[PDB]
Amino acid sequence: RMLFQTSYTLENNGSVICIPNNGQCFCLAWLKSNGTNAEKLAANILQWITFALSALCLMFYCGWEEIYVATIEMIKFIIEYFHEFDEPAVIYSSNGNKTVWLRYAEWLLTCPVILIHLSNLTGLANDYNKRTMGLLVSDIGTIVWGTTAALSKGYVRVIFFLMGLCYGIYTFFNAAKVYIEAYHTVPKGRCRQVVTGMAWLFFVSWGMFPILFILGPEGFGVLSVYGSTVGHTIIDLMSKNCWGLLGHYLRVLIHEHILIHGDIRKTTKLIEVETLVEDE
Amino acid sequence: RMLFQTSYTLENNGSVICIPNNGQCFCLAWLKSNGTNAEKLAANILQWITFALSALCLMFYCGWEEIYVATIEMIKFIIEYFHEFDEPAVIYSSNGNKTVWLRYAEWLLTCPVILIHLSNLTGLANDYNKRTMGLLVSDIGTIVWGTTAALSKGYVRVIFFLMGLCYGIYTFFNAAKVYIEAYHTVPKGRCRQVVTGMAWLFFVSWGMFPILFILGPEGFGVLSVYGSTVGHTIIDLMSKNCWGLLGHYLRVLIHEHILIHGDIRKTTKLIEVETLVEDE
Numbered sequence: 001r002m003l004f005q006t007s008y009t010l011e012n013n014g015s016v017i018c019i020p021n022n023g024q025c026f027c028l029a030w031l032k033s034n035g036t037n038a039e040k041l042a043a044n045i046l047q048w049i050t051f052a053l054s055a056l057c058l059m060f061y062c063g064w065e066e067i068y069v070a071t072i073e074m075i076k077f078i079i080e081y082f083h084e085f086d087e088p089a090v091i092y093s094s095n096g097n098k099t100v101w102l103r104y105a106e107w108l109l110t111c112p113v114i115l116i117h118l119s120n121l122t123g124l125a126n127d128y129n130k131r132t133m134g135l136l137v138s139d140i141g142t143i144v145w146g147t148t149a150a151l152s153k154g155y156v157r158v159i160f161f162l163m164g165l166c167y168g169i170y171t172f173f174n175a176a177k178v179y180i181e182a183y184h185t186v187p188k189g190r191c192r193q194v195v196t197g198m199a200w201l202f203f204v205s206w207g208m209f210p211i212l213f214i215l216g217p218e219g220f221g222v223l224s225v226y227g228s229t230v231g232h233t234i235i236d237l238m239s240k241n242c243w244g245l246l247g248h249y250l251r252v253l254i255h256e257h258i259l260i261h262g263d264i265r266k267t268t269k270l271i272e273v274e275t276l277v278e279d280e
Numbered sequence: 281r282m283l284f285q286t287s288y289t290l291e292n293n294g295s296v297i298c299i300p301n302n303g304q305c306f307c308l309a310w311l312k313s314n315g316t317n318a319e320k321l322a323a324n325i326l327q328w329i330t331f332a333l334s335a336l337c338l339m340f341y342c343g344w345e346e347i348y349v350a351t352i353e354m355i356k357f358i359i360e361y362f363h364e365f366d367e368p369a370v371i372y373s374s375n376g377n378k379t380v381w382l383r384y385a386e387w388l389l390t391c392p393v394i395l396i397h398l399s400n401l402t403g404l405a406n407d408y409n410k411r412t413m414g415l416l417v418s419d420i421g422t423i424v425w426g427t428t429a430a431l432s433k434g435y436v437r438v439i440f441f442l443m444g445l446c447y448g449i450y451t452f453f454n455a456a457k458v459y460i461e462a463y464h465t466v467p468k469g470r471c472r473q474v475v476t477g478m479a480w481l482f483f484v485s486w487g488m489f490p491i492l493f494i495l496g497p498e499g500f501g502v503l504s505v506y507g508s509t510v511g512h513t514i515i516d517l518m519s520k521n522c523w524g525l526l527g528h529y530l531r532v533l534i535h536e537h538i539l540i541h542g543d544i545r546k547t548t549k550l551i552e553v554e555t556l557v558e559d560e
């Protein structure tokens with residue numbers, strides 16, 4: 001069923017593998033199961049769901065960040081639906097790895113844009129500062145190292161994962177300051193509840209990715225690839241759809257505030273944050 | 281010599297390939313030559329050279345952008361020197377592709393940081409605006425599509441390359457406005473010469489990458505992988521080392537200007553640019 005060699009004969013009491021000279025690549029590790037049909041189904045359902053609300057979110061939705069990830073997201077399901085396990089949505093490499101490049105490519109496409117969104121939670125500003133650049137670079141870095149880790153094996157996989165981890169820690173800390181700052185920047189009411197919710201959504205969801213990597217085929221293989229897919233789809237849901245929804249909601253709330261009360265700032269000490277207020 | 285299967289027997293008048301059942305992956309396309317020994321040598325020399333001046337640049341060199349790419353750059357040579365063709369510095373995939381993930385990973389790590397630098401050529405500002413974010417997203421996008429294109433074959437490779445191309449065009453246009461703006465922002469003298477030089481360095485160098493892709497194994501294979509390596513090393517030199525040098529030079533010049541004359545702006549019309557001037 002694959003576009004690589006899946007059919008083969010064992011010869012010489014299993015010491016030889018004979019293959020059609022058909023120009024197809026071959027490897028046993030590639031034929032290993034992606035997981036149970038139940039996990040498969042759980043995976044396909046969740047994908048349809050995230051596709052469904054990515055479409056719903058897109059229908060419903062500058063605010064460009066979230067339409068951008070929703071566009072990437074439903075683009076990705078289009079690929080998943082038709083080619084999820086075709087090279088190179090999955091990369092079957094010469095070391096036997098199956099690396100879900102669809103996932104890592106998606107992260108590359110969406111994470112910086114989420115971080116850009118995070119860097120401007122209010123949506124008001126020509127915000128972007130040095131912090132934001134660090135957020136972006138550290139995060140692209142973690143994805144590159146993680147992807148490299150996924151593509152690797154043994155010690156070097158460990159090294160790259162650890163490099164990704166160091167970049168990730170840097171990203172989380174940076175994101176945290178941003179969330180802390182945003183909390184004190186936005187109006188005292190509901191806006192601070194959703195910033196808080198976004199922080200939670202963000203750190204749990206984003207923190208789950210290295211956990212999933214550790215658990216997945218790229219790690220200690222406690223999760224099958226379907227299992228990994230299931231997990232990733234849940235935290236995709238959280239990190240892309242739910243977070244972006246809150247983020248959109250936060251922005252609507254800020255705008256409505258800005259519209260009704262004007263844009264009024266009172267300096268608060270943390271670095272200094274220009275807090276939104278209702279009155280003079 | 282490779283960590284995949286390179287040794288094999290043709291059986292049944294060449295219709296069967298028999299392989300040791302040793303758990304190694306096998307594919308004929310992987311064994312195809314990387315190129316001539318001359319191209320190999322040209323490649324190894326150029327790599328040592330860029331390594332050498334990346335070290336020299338690093339020794340010589342916030343100005344964080346250029347130390348960051350120089351760090352990535354000499355990190356990459358460390359890998360190249362030891363593992364250039366080992367999975368996954370090169371990805372040998374089940375469709376037969378050899379995809380130079382070292383290169384694409386490097387681009388992911390360095391290009392946004394170059395673009396961040398470009399977005400703040402003077403080094404003065406807490407610059408970063410919406411434009412910069414577009415620069416970053418479009419460029420990460422072109423690399424993702426190009427990498428995906430490299431990993432792919434036929435029509436889908438064409439599609440992704442074309443998607444990368446569309447993102448790239450967007451990036452070039454954006455970069456152009458930035459260069460245009462920077463030219464009119466920096467002091468009238470030598471600072472505008474190097475901005476001009478940087479623009480040239482940038483558009484020629486960066487424009488050569490899709491050309492190289494088109495010419496390379498990922499494209500119409502007019503260049504061998506060594507040939508591709510040679511080409512990429514030249515435009516790496518241009519885009520990373522030479523550009524960053526100019527960029528560093530530009531910043532030193534701006535600072536010296538700022539120090540001597542102060543920071544004095546006169547608004548010029550293009551969008552409005554706050555031009556650096558020497559006197560009131």
Ligand SMILES: *C/C=C(C)/C=C/C=C(C)/C=C/C1=C(C)CCCC1(C)C
Pocket residue numbers: 106107110111114142143145146147149160161162164165168169206207209210213236239240
């Ligand atoms: C929508 C997708 C998102 C928000 C993905 C985020 C992914 C990460 C934060 C990945 C992090 C990783 C580490 C922190 C360690 C290295 C391995 C990774 C790539 C899984």
Ligand SMILES: *C/C=C(C)/C=C/C=C(C)/C=C/C1=C(C)CCCC1(C)C
Pocket residue numbers: 386387390391394422423425426427429440441442444445448449486487489490493516519520
């Ligand atoms: C230091 C490395 C640099 C500056 C690399 C830049 C690479 C590009 C601008 C690649 C561009 C591509 C396209 C514009 C079309 C799609 C294929 C690519 C990825 C080669």
